[PDB]
Amino acid sequence: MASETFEFQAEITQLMSLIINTVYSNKEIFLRELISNASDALDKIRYKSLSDPKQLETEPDLFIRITPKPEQKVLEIRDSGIGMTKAELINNLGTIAKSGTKAFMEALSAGADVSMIGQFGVGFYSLFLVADRVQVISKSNDDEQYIWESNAGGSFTVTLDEVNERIGRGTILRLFLKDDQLEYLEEKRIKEVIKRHSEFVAYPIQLVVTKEVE
Amino acid sequence: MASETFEFQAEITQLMSLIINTVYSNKEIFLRELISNASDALDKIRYKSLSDPKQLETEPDLFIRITPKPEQKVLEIRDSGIGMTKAELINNLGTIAKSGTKAFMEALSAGADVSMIGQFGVGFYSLFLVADRVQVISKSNDDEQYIWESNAGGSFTVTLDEVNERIGRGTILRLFLKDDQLEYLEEKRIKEVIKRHSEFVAYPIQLVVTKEVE
Ligand SMILES: COC1=C2C[C@H](C)C[C@H](OC)[C@H](O)[C@@H](C)/C=C(\C)[C@H](OC(N)=O)[C@@H](OC)/C=C\C=C(/C)C(=O)NC(=CC1=O)C2=O
Ligand SMILES: COC1=C2C[C@H](C)C[C@H](OC)[C@H](O)[C@@H](C)/C=C(\C)[C@H](OC(N)=O)[C@@H](OC)/C=C\C=C(/C)C(=O)NC(=CC1=O)C2=O
């Protein structure tokens, strides 16, 4: 109970401003980046489990799952990857300077394509193209479940999780989509962009659709 | 944190034994009863909201939703009805003698059909036909979210909810299905039985299916 606030490294809060206020037209690349991160966290736990099998027991199923929640205008990208501890959330998701942050921005300025973001190692923030608020719910075998939240301001909060479903292991990227990005709540659109830029994913990508029984 | 244990009224733990160990063949009637209860809790909040509109604000959408969770061999029936407080869970779901409990059993003995259960006012326990463990996660506007759990023994537990997703208002019936009742995790089967016995439900019945993107 009760959150802790942290300030974002100055260049990182710069990137977010840049991304959130970026009339860019190829916004669909955010799914590519998030699915890509999901697959990377699944690789880690798998590789890591090569000499530590028990690590898998917390969730034997390796997968990636997208769940749109229309009523809340939310879209969630989930994975049963290695997950992150509270330290790593605070550490890697905000307070510590990141290698490619400044470079990408300059590249972006020189006319670079926003889809290069992933090549600069800061693709997670691409999510701010379609969303104006996000929660990173994560659970690592080495710690408890926590919620990392941000609205692209200058500070972010980390809270012990007591309000969300329990994920065996992994992360959930809960994106509160912009009022004009609701198209990513639609099954067709989602399926469309997953096929366009995510053909070589090694884990099953599951889409959760809700339908009224006729 | 930390659960409280309660004993079941003696006749009620009798009914459960009777139901769980009942070779009956028309087990699909459990969905009828649970959907029926869902629709009843939705009626209450609606009616009740006739003179207390704000009561709806906690969850403006009236609906019923079934979500099978294969990996956990779980099936959930959810509704955004009036929900129940901790008192009512302890009170109405176990400790207080119920009017039709003894009568149904006798009727069942005289050769009655198990699907009459709902007519005796004890249809909730029909769920024990396909499941051997259940959790009633509920949240009423008049209280906090709690988890009521049972395995058909002689006692049940009520715990303040800190491990499940937050439901605006309503109840979730999390049924841990029997090893031979997994057929209710299948979309076809589910859709089949909903159409068979639940044609006159006034609220949208939503089915949540998970599928791998081709
Ligand atoms: C090759 O490694 C990658 C890294 C290094 C990273 C910090 C190491 C990290 O340690 C804490 C874990 O190894 C790893 C399991 C987790 C993630 C990918 C997360 O994905 C999920 N589902 O867990 C993502 O979660 C919202 C979090 C931060 C990502 C940043 C700032 C980014 O923008 N780009 C990157 C993409 C990568 O794949 C990146 O920097
Ligand atoms: C006409 O009223 C009904 C009652 C009276 C009942 C105790 C009053 C109750 O007060 C606490 C609320 O008014 C009501 C909102 C909630 C429910 C139906 C629940 O459904 C959900 N989704 O909330 C069900 O939840 C697992 C709980 C207990 C049910 C029992 C023991 C039963 O087996 N049969 C009955 C079916 C009914 O519809 C029944 O007895």
Short mmCIF file of C-alpha atoms and ligand atoms in Angstrom, two decimals:
data_model
loop_
_atom_site.label_atom_id
_atom_site.label_comp_id
_atom_site.label_asym_id
_atom_site.label_seq_id
_atom_site.Cartn_x
_atom_site.Cartn_y
_atom_site.Cartn_z
CA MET A 1 0.00 0.00 0.00
CA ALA A 2 1.13 3.57 -0.74
CA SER A 3 3.26 4.54 -3.72
CA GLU A 4 6.79 5.85 -4.03
CA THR A 5 7.61 8.62 -6.50
CA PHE A 6 10.71 8.82 -8.64
CA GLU A 7 11.94 11.46 -11.05
CA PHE A 8 12.73 10.53 -14.64
CA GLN A 9 16.23 11.09 -15.98
CA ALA A 10 15.99 14.49 -17.69
CA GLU A 11 16.62 13.20 -21.20
CA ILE A 12 14.03 10.47 -20.77
CA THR A 13 11.24 12.89 -19.87
CA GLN A 14 12.40 14.75 -23.00
CA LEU A 15 11.87 11.69 -25.22
CA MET A 16 8.37 11.20 -23.83
CA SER A 17 7.38 14.80 -24.52
CA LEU A 18 8.82 14.38 -28.01
CA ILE A 19 6.90 11.15 -28.60
CA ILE A 20 3.56 12.13 -27.06
CA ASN A 21 3.55 15.39 -29.03
CA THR A 22 4.66 13.80 -32.31
CA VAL A 23 2.24 14.08 -35.24
CA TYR A 24 4.07 11.03 -36.69
CA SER A 25 1.83 8.91 -38.96
CA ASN A 26 3.17 5.37 -38.50
CA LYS A 27 1.97 4.99 -34.87
CA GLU A 28 1.21 1.30 -35.28
CA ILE A 29 4.90 0.52 -34.71
CA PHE A 30 4.28 0.59 -30.95
CA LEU A 31 2.87 -2.96 -31.06
CA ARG A 32 5.98 -4.13 -32.87
CA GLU A 33 8.18 -2.75 -30.11
CA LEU A 34 6.07 -4.07 -27.21
CA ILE A 35 5.72 -7.53 -28.72
CA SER A 36 9.45 -7.42 -29.39
CA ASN A 37 10.15 -6.63 -25.74
CA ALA A 38 7.79 -9.41 -24.69
CA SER A 39 9.64 -11.93 -26.83
CA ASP A 40 12.92 -10.73 -25.34
CA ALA A 41 11.77 -11.27 -21.77
CA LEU A 42 10.58 -14.75 -22.74
CA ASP A 43 14.03 -15.51 -24.22
CA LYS A 44 15.69 -14.53 -20.96
CA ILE A 45 13.61 -16.77 -18.70
CA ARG A 46 14.00 -19.61 -21.21
CA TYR A 47 17.77 -19.20 -21.56
CA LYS A 48 18.13 -18.58 -17.85
CA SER A 49 16.06 -21.69 -17.17
CA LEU A 50 18.59 -23.80 -19.11
CA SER A 51 20.56 -24.21 -15.87
CA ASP A 52 17.71 -23.38 -13.51
CA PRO A 53 14.62 -25.34 -14.67
CA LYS A 54 12.55 -24.62 -11.56
CA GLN A 55 12.40 -21.01 -12.73
CA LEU A 56 9.70 -22.07 -15.20
CA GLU A 57 7.41 -23.68 -12.61
CA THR A 58 5.93 -20.29 -11.71
CA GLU A 59 4.29 -20.33 -15.15
CA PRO A 60 5.14 -23.26 -17.48
CA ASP A 61 3.49 -21.58 -20.48
CA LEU A 62 5.57 -19.24 -22.61
CA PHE A 63 3.32 -16.91 -24.58
CA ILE A 64 2.41 -13.31 -25.52
CA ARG A 65 -1.18 -12.12 -25.11
CA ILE A 66 -3.03 -8.99 -26.22
CA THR A 67 -6.30 -8.11 -24.45
CA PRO A 68 -8.23 -5.02 -25.50
CA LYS A 69 -10.60 -3.62 -22.84
CA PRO A 70 -12.96 -1.30 -24.82
CA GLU A 71 -15.02 0.03 -21.90
CA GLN A 72 -11.82 1.28 -20.25
CA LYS A 73 -10.25 2.17 -23.61
CA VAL A 74 -7.34 -0.01 -22.56
CA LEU A 75 -5.13 -2.44 -24.46
CA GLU A 76 -2.86 -4.84 -22.63
CA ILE A 77 0.18 -6.65 -23.98
CA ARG A 78 1.17 -9.44 -21.66
CA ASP A 79 4.01 -11.99 -21.63
CA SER A 80 5.15 -14.77 -19.29
CA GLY A 81 8.74 -13.60 -19.55
CA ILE A 82 11.36 -13.08 -16.84
CA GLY A 83 9.49 -10.12 -15.35
CA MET A 84 11.14 -7.31 -13.37
CA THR A 85 11.76 -6.66 -9.66
CA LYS A 86 10.88 -3.38 -7.97
CA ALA A 87 14.57 -2.34 -8.17
CA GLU A 88 14.73 -3.00 -11.89
CA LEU A 89 11.50 -1.16 -12.50
CA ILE A 90 12.80 1.93 -10.70
CA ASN A 91 16.27 1.45 -12.18
CA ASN A 92 15.57 0.51 -15.80
CA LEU A 93 12.30 2.30 -16.29
CA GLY A 94 13.20 5.88 -15.55
CA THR A 95 15.86 7.00 -13.08
CA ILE A 96 19.05 5.79 -14.81
CA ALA A 97 20.29 7.49 -18.00
CA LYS A 98 19.86 5.30 -21.10
CA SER A 99 22.50 4.94 -23.81
CA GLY A 100 20.47 5.72 -26.93
CA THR A 101 18.02 8.32 -25.62
CA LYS A 102 19.91 11.44 -26.69
CA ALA A 103 21.09 9.88 -29.97
CA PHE A 104 17.63 8.87 -31.15
CA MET A 105 16.24 12.32 -30.48
CA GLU A 106 19.03 13.90 -32.50
CA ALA A 107 18.51 11.30 -35.23
CA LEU A 108 14.78 12.02 -35.07
CA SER A 109 15.65 15.68 -35.46
CA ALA A 110 17.96 15.10 -38.42
CA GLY A 111 14.93 13.50 -40.07
CA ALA A 112 15.16 9.92 -38.85
CA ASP A 113 12.14 7.64 -38.88
CA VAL A 114 10.42 7.15 -35.49
CA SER A 115 10.34 3.38 -36.13
CA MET A 116 14.14 3.37 -35.65
CA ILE A 117 13.53 3.95 -31.95
CA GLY A 118 13.91 0.25 -31.27
CA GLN A 119 17.33 0.38 -32.86
CA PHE A 120 18.43 2.99 -30.32
CA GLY A 121 17.31 0.82 -27.42
CA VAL A 122 14.46 3.03 -26.21
CA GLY A 123 11.50 1.46 -28.01
CA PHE A 124 9.39 1.05 -24.88
CA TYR A 125 8.53 4.76 -24.96
CA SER A 126 7.02 4.32 -28.43
CA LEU A 127 3.89 3.27 -26.58
CA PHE A 128 3.39 6.96 -25.88
CA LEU A 129 2.40 7.35 -29.53
CA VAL A 130 -1.06 5.82 -28.97
CA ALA A 131 -1.35 6.17 -25.18
CA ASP A 132 -1.11 9.06 -22.73
CA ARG A 133 -0.84 6.90 -19.56
CA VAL A 134 0.64 3.47 -18.81
CA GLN A 135 1.03 0.90 -16.06
CA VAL A 136 3.72 -1.74 -16.07
CA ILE A 137 2.49 -4.54 -13.83
CA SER A 138 5.30 -7.03 -13.41
CA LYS A 139 6.15 -10.09 -11.35
CA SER A 140 9.61 -11.65 -11.31
CA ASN A 141 10.46 -14.94 -9.59
CA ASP A 142 12.90 -12.86 -7.54
CA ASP A 143 10.34 -10.43 -6.10
CA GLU A 144 6.71 -9.51 -5.62
CA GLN A 145 4.21 -7.98 -8.03
CA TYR A 146 4.48 -4.22 -8.47
CA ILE A 147 2.80 -1.53 -10.53
CA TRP A 148 4.97 1.07 -12.26
CA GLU A 149 2.87 3.93 -13.62
CA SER A 150 3.41 7.00 -15.76
CA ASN A 151 1.54 9.76 -17.61
CA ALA A 152 4.69 11.08 -19.35
CA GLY A 153 5.29 13.71 -16.68
CA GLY A 154 8.63 14.11 -14.95
CA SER A 155 8.02 11.53 -12.23
CA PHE A 156 6.78 7.96 -12.01
CA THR A 157 5.37 5.81 -9.22
CA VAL A 158 6.05 2.23 -8.12
CA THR A 159 3.48 0.46 -5.92
CA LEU A 160 3.26 -3.04 -4.44
CA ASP A 161 0.45 -4.72 -6.39
CA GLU A 162 -2.76 -5.40 -4.45
CA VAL A 163 -5.35 -4.48 -7.05
CA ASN A 164 -4.58 -6.60 -10.13
CA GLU A 165 -4.95 -10.25 -11.04
CA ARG A 166 -1.98 -12.35 -10.07
CA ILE A 167 0.34 -13.14 -12.96
CA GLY A 168 2.47 -16.24 -12.35
CA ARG A 169 5.47 -14.51 -13.84
CA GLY A 170 5.84 -11.85 -16.46
CA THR A 171 4.75 -8.35 -17.27
CA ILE A 172 1.58 -6.64 -18.37
CA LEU A 173 1.72 -3.41 -20.31
CA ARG A 174 -1.58 -1.70 -19.64
CA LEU A 175 -1.94 1.11 -22.18
CA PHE A 176 -4.67 3.67 -21.60
CA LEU A 177 -5.16 4.56 -25.28
CA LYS A 178 -5.65 8.10 -26.59
CA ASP A 179 -9.18 9.17 -27.60
CA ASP A 180 -8.17 8.93 -31.25
CA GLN A 181 -6.23 5.65 -31.02
CA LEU A 182 -9.17 3.42 -30.08
CA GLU A 183 -8.65 1.58 -33.34
CA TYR A 184 -6.23 -0.66 -31.49
CA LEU A 185 -9.09 -2.07 -29.43
CA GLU A 186 -10.50 -3.62 -32.61
CA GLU A 187 -9.61 -7.25 -33.36
CA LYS A 188 -9.18 -6.64 -37.09
CA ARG A 189 -6.81 -3.70 -36.71
CA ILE A 190 -4.74 -5.54 -34.09
CA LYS A 191 -4.48 -8.73 -36.16
CA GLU A 192 -3.61 -6.53 -39.13
CA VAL A 193 -0.60 -4.80 -37.57
CA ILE A 194 0.69 -7.97 -35.87
CA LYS A 195 0.95 -9.67 -39.24
CA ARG A 196 2.50 -6.63 -40.88
CA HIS A 197 5.51 -6.25 -38.57
CA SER A 198 5.66 -9.33 -36.35
CA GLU A 199 6.07 -12.35 -38.61
CA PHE A 200 9.11 -13.83 -36.88
CA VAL A 201 8.05 -14.10 -33.25
CA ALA A 202 9.01 -17.43 -31.64
CA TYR A 203 6.19 -17.50 -29.09
CA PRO A 204 2.45 -17.90 -29.66
CA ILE A 205 0.77 -14.53 -29.88
CA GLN A 206 -2.72 -14.80 -28.42
CA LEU A 207 -5.50 -12.28 -28.96
CA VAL A 208 -8.36 -12.23 -26.42
CA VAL A 209 -11.66 -11.25 -28.01
CA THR A 210 -14.92 -10.67 -26.14
CA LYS A 211 -18.15 -11.45 -27.97
CA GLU A 212 -21.87 -11.43 -27.19
CA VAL A 213 -23.51 -14.83 -27.55
CA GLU A 214 -26.01 -14.49 -30.38
CA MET B 1 -4.69 -10.28 4.57
CA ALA B 2 -5.44 -13.51 6.46
CA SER B 3 -8.67 -15.46 6.09
CA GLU B 4 -11.52 -16.17 8.47
CA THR B 5 -13.10 -19.62 8.62
CA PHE B 6 -16.78 -20.35 8.97
CA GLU B 7 -18.68 -23.59 9.33
CA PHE B 8 -21.45 -24.45 6.87
CA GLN B 9 -24.97 -25.02 8.17
CA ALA B 10 -25.15 -28.82 8.56
CA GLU B 11 -27.81 -29.34 5.90
CA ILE B 12 -25.89 -27.22 3.42
CA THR B 13 -22.71 -29.29 3.71
CA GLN B 14 -25.08 -32.24 3.15
CA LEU B 15 -26.36 -30.82 -0.15
CA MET B 16 -22.80 -30.27 -1.38
CA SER B 17 -21.78 -33.85 -0.60
CA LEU B 18 -24.95 -34.98 -2.38
CA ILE B 19 -24.21 -32.83 -5.43
CA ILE B 20 -20.47 -33.44 -5.73
CA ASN B 21 -21.02 -37.20 -5.46
CA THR B 22 -23.99 -37.29 -7.85
CA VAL B 23 -23.55 -39.37 -11.02
CA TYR B 24 -26.34 -37.19 -12.49
CA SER B 25 -26.09 -36.86 -16.30
CA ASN B 26 -27.51 -33.40 -17.01
CA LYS B 27 -24.60 -31.47 -15.41
CA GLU B 28 -24.79 -28.65 -17.93
CA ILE B 29 -27.65 -27.09 -15.91
CA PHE B 30 -25.06 -25.39 -13.67
CA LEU B 31 -24.53 -22.65 -16.27
CA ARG B 32 -28.27 -22.04 -16.37
CA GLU B 33 -28.34 -21.50 -12.63
CA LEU B 34 -25.24 -19.28 -12.47
CA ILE B 35 -26.34 -17.13 -15.40
CA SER B 36 -29.74 -16.95 -13.75
CA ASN B 37 -28.19 -15.71 -10.51
CA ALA B 38 -26.13 -13.19 -12.48
CA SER B 39 -29.23 -11.80 -14.15
CA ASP B 40 -30.92 -11.56 -10.76
CA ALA B 41 -28.10 -9.52 -9.24
CA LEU B 42 -28.21 -7.22 -12.28
CA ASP B 43 -31.98 -6.74 -11.76
CA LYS B 44 -31.40 -5.70 -8.16
CA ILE B 45 -28.82 -3.00 -8.89
CA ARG B 46 -30.98 -1.75 -11.77
CA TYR B 47 -34.19 -1.68 -9.74
CA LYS B 48 -32.35 -0.30 -6.73
CA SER B 49 -30.79 2.35 -8.95
CA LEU B 50 -34.27 3.60 -9.91
CA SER B 51 -34.18 5.87 -6.85
CA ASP B 52 -30.41 5.87 -6.41
CA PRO B 53 -28.83 6.47 -9.85
CA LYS B 54 -25.30 7.06 -8.54
CA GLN B 55 -25.24 3.37 -7.62
CA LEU B 56 -24.55 2.62 -11.29
CA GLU B 57 -21.51 4.91 -11.59
CA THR B 58 -19.25 2.22 -10.13
CA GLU B 59 -19.80 0.28 -13.36
CA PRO B 60 -22.25 1.77 -15.92
CA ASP B 61 -22.26 -1.41 -18.00
CA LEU B 62 -24.76 -4.13 -17.15
CA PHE B 63 -23.61 -7.46 -18.55
CA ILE B 64 -22.80 -11.14 -17.91
CA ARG B 65 -19.43 -12.54 -19.01
CA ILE B 66 -18.02 -16.06 -19.23
CA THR B 67 -14.23 -16.47 -19.39
CA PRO B 68 -12.71 -19.94 -19.62
CA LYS B 69 -9.09 -20.20 -18.44
CA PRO B 70 -7.85 -23.54 -19.92
CA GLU B 71 -4.35 -23.57 -18.42
CA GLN B 72 -5.87 -23.30 -14.94
CA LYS B 73 -8.86 -25.47 -15.90
CA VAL B 74 -11.02 -22.61 -14.68
CA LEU B 75 -14.27 -21.12 -15.95
CA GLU B 76 -15.52 -17.80 -14.66
CA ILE B 77 -19.05 -16.44 -14.80
CA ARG B 78 -19.04 -12.74 -14.07
CA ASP B 79 -21.76 -10.09 -13.75
CA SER B 80 -21.87 -6.37 -12.93
CA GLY B 81 -24.77 -6.92 -10.56
CA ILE B 82 -25.35 -5.60 -7.04
CA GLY B 83 -22.52 -7.70 -5.59
CA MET B 84 -22.34 -8.85 -1.96
CA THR B 85 -20.71 -7.47 1.20
CA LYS B 86 -18.53 -9.57 3.48
CA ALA B 87 -21.50 -9.96 5.88
CA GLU B 88 -23.77 -11.21 3.13
CA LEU B 89 -21.16 -13.61 1.87
CA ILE B 90 -20.74 -15.15 5.31
CA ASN B 91 -24.47 -14.90 5.98
CA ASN B 92 -26.04 -16.01 2.69
CA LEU B 93 -23.33 -18.31 1.45
CA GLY B 94 -23.09 -20.85 4.22
CA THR B 95 -23.74 -20.16 7.90
CA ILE B 96 -27.50 -19.47 7.88
CA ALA B 97 -29.99 -22.29 7.25
CA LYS B 98 -31.69 -22.03 3.84
CA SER B 99 -35.40 -22.63 3.28
CA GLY B 100 -35.32 -25.17 0.44
CA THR B 101 -32.17 -27.14 1.27
CA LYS B 102 -33.80 -30.02 3.13
CA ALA B 103 -36.82 -30.13 0.80
CA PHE B 104 -34.79 -30.40 -2.39
CA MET B 105 -32.72 -33.25 -1.00
CA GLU B 106 -35.87 -35.15 -0.05
CA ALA B 107 -37.35 -34.36 -3.47
CA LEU B 108 -34.09 -35.49 -5.05
CA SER B 109 -34.42 -38.68 -3.02
CA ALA B 110 -38.03 -39.27 -4.04
CA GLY B 111 -36.71 -39.21 -7.61
CA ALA B 112 -36.81 -35.51 -8.43
CA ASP B 113 -34.71 -34.07 -11.23
CA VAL B 114 -31.52 -32.25 -10.13
CA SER B 115 -32.42 -29.36 -12.47
CA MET B 116 -35.28 -28.50 -10.07
CA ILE B 117 -32.66 -27.27 -7.62
CA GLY B 118 -33.19 -23.71 -8.77
CA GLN B 119 -36.85 -24.05 -7.91
CA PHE B 120 -35.94 -24.84 -4.31
CA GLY B 121 -33.78 -21.74 -4.04
CA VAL B 122 -30.42 -23.49 -3.69
CA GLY B 123 -29.23 -23.52 -7.31
CA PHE B 124 -25.86 -21.96 -6.55
CA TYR B 125 -24.59 -25.31 -5.25
CA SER B 126 -25.32 -26.89 -8.63
CA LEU B 127 -21.91 -25.59 -9.62
CA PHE B 128 -20.52 -28.48 -7.59
CA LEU B 129 -21.64 -30.77 -10.40
CA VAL B 130 -18.75 -29.75 -12.68
CA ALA B 131 -16.37 -28.22 -10.11
CA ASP B 132 -14.76 -29.44 -6.89
CA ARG B 133 -13.59 -25.98 -5.68
CA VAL B 134 -14.96 -22.44 -6.06
CA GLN B 135 -14.18 -18.82 -5.26
CA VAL B 136 -16.83 -16.14 -5.10
CA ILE B 137 -15.04 -12.84 -5.64
CA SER B 138 -17.52 -10.05 -5.05
CA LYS B 139 -17.58 -6.28 -4.71
CA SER B 140 -20.65 -4.36 -3.56
CA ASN B 141 -20.95 -0.57 -3.56
CA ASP B 142 -21.48 -0.94 0.19
CA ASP B 143 -18.20 -2.71 0.96
CA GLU B 144 -14.81 -3.85 -0.25
CA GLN B 145 -13.83 -6.76 -2.49
CA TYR B 146 -13.69 -10.13 -0.78
CA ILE B 147 -13.00 -13.72 -1.76
CA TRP B 148 -15.31 -16.45 -0.45
CA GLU B 149 -13.87 -19.91 -1.10
CA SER B 150 -14.99 -23.50 -0.73
CA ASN B 151 -14.02 -27.07 -1.64
CA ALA B 152 -17.34 -28.55 -0.44
CA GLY B 153 -15.95 -29.38 2.99
CA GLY B 154 -17.67 -28.33 6.19
CA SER B 155 -16.10 -24.87 6.41
CA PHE B 156 -15.54 -21.92 4.11
CA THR B 157 -13.21 -18.93 4.16
CA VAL B 158 -13.74 -15.22 3.51
CA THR B 159 -10.71 -13.03 2.71
CA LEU B 160 -10.29 -9.35 1.86
CA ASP B 161 -9.32 -9.33 -1.83
CA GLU B 162 -5.74 -8.31 -2.61
CA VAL B 163 -4.88 -10.81 -5.33
CA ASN B 164 -7.55 -10.39 -8.04
CA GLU B 165 -8.34 -7.79 -10.66
CA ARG B 166 -10.58 -5.03 -9.42
CA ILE B 167 -14.19 -5.41 -10.48
CA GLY B 168 -16.11 -2.12 -10.44
CA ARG B 169 -19.11 -3.84 -8.95
CA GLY B 170 -20.41 -7.35 -9.19
CA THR B 171 -19.40 -10.93 -8.61
CA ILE B 172 -17.12 -13.44 -10.24
CA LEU B 173 -17.78 -17.13 -9.88
CA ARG B 174 -14.42 -18.80 -10.39
CA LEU B 175 -15.07 -22.51 -10.91
CA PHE B 176 -12.10 -24.85 -10.74
CA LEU B 177 -13.57 -27.51 -13.05
CA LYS B 178 -13.30 -31.27 -12.46
CA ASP B 179 -10.79 -33.25 -14.54
CA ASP B 180 -13.66 -34.68 -16.57
CA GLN B 181 -15.65 -31.45 -16.97
CA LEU B 182 -13.09 -29.56 -19.05
CA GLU B 183 -15.59 -29.52 -21.88
CA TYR B 184 -16.94 -26.30 -20.41
CA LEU B 185 -13.69 -24.54 -21.29
CA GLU B 186 -14.52 -25.02 -24.97
CA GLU B 187 -16.25 -22.15 -26.78
CA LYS B 188 -18.55 -24.44 -28.77
CA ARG B 189 -19.81 -26.38 -25.76
CA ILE B 190 -20.37 -23.17 -23.77
CA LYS B 191 -22.23 -21.44 -26.60
CA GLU B 192 -24.22 -24.64 -27.04
CA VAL B 193 -25.56 -24.86 -23.48
CA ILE B 194 -26.19 -21.10 -23.19
CA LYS B 195 -28.53 -21.27 -26.17
CA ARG B 196 -30.21 -24.44 -24.92
CA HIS B 197 -31.35 -23.13 -21.52
CA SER B 198 -30.75 -19.37 -21.46
CA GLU B 199 -32.82 -17.85 -24.27
CA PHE B 200 -34.61 -15.24 -22.17
CA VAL B 201 -31.79 -13.38 -20.42
CA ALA B 202 -32.23 -9.59 -20.47
CA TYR B 203 -28.54 -8.73 -20.32
CA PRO B 204 -25.85 -9.27 -22.95
CA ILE B 205 -24.04 -12.52 -22.36
CA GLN B 206 -20.42 -12.14 -23.41
CA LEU B 207 -18.03 -15.00 -24.06
CA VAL B 208 -14.28 -14.25 -23.89
CA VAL B 209 -12.28 -16.41 -26.28
CA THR B 210 -8.48 -16.51 -26.52
CA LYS B 211 -6.97 -17.27 -29.91
CA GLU B 212 -3.48 -17.51 -31.41
CA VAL B 213 -2.89 -15.04 -34.23
CA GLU B 214 -2.33 -17.15 -37.35
C1 LIG C 1 17.93 -6.92 -24.91
O1 LIG C 1 17.13 -6.24 -23.81
C2 LIG C 1 16.20 -5.12 -23.79
C3 LIG C 1 16.42 -3.98 -23.01
C4 LIG C 1 17.20 -3.95 -21.70
C5 LIG C 1 16.43 -3.90 -20.33
C6 LIG C 1 16.25 -2.60 -19.46
C7 LIG C 1 16.78 -5.14 -19.49
C8 LIG C 1 15.60 -5.56 -18.62
O2 LIG C 1 16.03 -5.47 -17.27
C9 LIG C 1 15.29 -4.64 -16.39
C10 LIG C 1 15.04 -7.00 -18.79
O3 LIG C 1 16.12 -7.79 -19.34
C11 LIG C 1 13.89 -7.16 -19.81
C12 LIG C 1 13.24 -8.51 -19.51
C13 LIG C 1 12.60 -6.41 -20.03
C14 LIG C 1 11.99 -5.66 -20.98
C15 LIG C 1 12.13 -5.67 -22.46
C16 LIG C 1 10.61 -5.09 -20.75
O4 LIG C 1 9.71 -6.00 -21.43
C17 LIG C 1 9.00 -6.83 -20.71
N1 LIG C 1 7.89 -7.36 -21.20
O5 LIG C 1 9.39 -7.33 -19.69
C18 LIG C 1 10.31 -3.57 -20.83
O6 LIG C 1 9.09 -3.63 -20.11
C19 LIG C 1 8.22 -2.52 -20.18
C20 LIG C 1 11.23 -2.65 -20.00
C21 LIG C 1 12.21 -1.72 -20.24
C22 LIG C 1 12.69 -1.36 -21.61
C23 LIG C 1 13.40 -0.27 -22.10
C24 LIG C 1 13.88 0.96 -21.22
C25 LIG C 1 13.43 -0.27 -23.66
O7 LIG C 1 12.77 0.69 -24.10
N2 LIG C 1 14.12 -1.16 -24.55
C26 LIG C 1 14.76 -2.57 -24.45
C27 LIG C 1 14.27 -3.71 -25.01
C28 LIG C 1 14.85 -5.05 -24.63
O8 LIG C 1 14.30 -6.08 -25.00
C29 LIG C 1 15.86 -2.64 -23.43
O9 LIG C 1 16.28 -1.59 -22.95
C1 LIG C 2 -34.17 -13.79 -5.83
O1 LIG C 2 -32.80 -13.95 -5.20
C2 LIG C 2 -31.84 -15.05 -5.13
C3 LIG C 2 -31.41 -15.60 -3.93
C4 LIG C 2 -31.33 -14.86 -2.60
C5 LIG C 2 -29.94 -14.35 -2.07
C6 LIG C 2 -29.10 -15.05 -0.94
C7 LIG C 2 -29.97 -12.81 -1.93
C8 LIG C 2 -28.59 -12.21 -2.20
O2 LIG C 2 -28.19 -11.56 -1.00
C9 LIG C 2 -26.97 -11.95 -0.41
C10 LIG C 2 -28.46 -11.16 -3.33
O3 LIG C 2 -29.78 -10.58 -3.50
C11 LIG C 2 -28.10 -11.71 -4.73
C12 LIG C 2 -27.62 -10.52 -5.55
C13 LIG C 2 -27.03 -12.68 -5.21
C14 LIG C 2 -26.94 -13.88 -5.82
C15 LIG C 2 -27.87 -14.58 -6.74
C16 LIG C 2 -25.58 -14.48 -6.13
O4 LIG C 2 -25.37 -14.18 -7.54
C17 LIG C 2 -24.53 -13.23 -7.85
N1 LIG C 2 -23.96 -13.21 -9.05
O5 LIG C 2 -24.36 -12.24 -7.20
C18 LIG C 2 -25.14 -15.87 -5.60
O6 LIG C 2 -23.75 -15.65 -5.82
C19 LIG C 2 -22.90 -16.78 -5.79
C20 LIG C 2 -25.29 -16.09 -4.08
C21 LIG C 2 -26.08 -16.84 -3.25
C22 LIG C 2 -27.16 -17.75 -3.72
C23 LIG C 2 -27.84 -18.81 -3.13
C24 LIG C 2 -27.55 -19.35 -1.66
C25 LIG C 2 -28.72 -19.58 -4.17
O7 LIG C 2 -28.26 -20.72 -4.34
N2 LIG C 2 -29.91 -19.14 -4.83
C26 LIG C 2 -30.62 -17.79 -5.11
C27 LIG C 2 -30.71 -17.17 -6.32
C28 LIG C 2 -31.19 -15.74 -6.41
O8 LIG C 2 -31.10 -15.14 -7.46
C29 LIG C 2 -30.97 -17.04 -3.86
O9 LIG C 2 -30.88 -17.63 -2.78
#
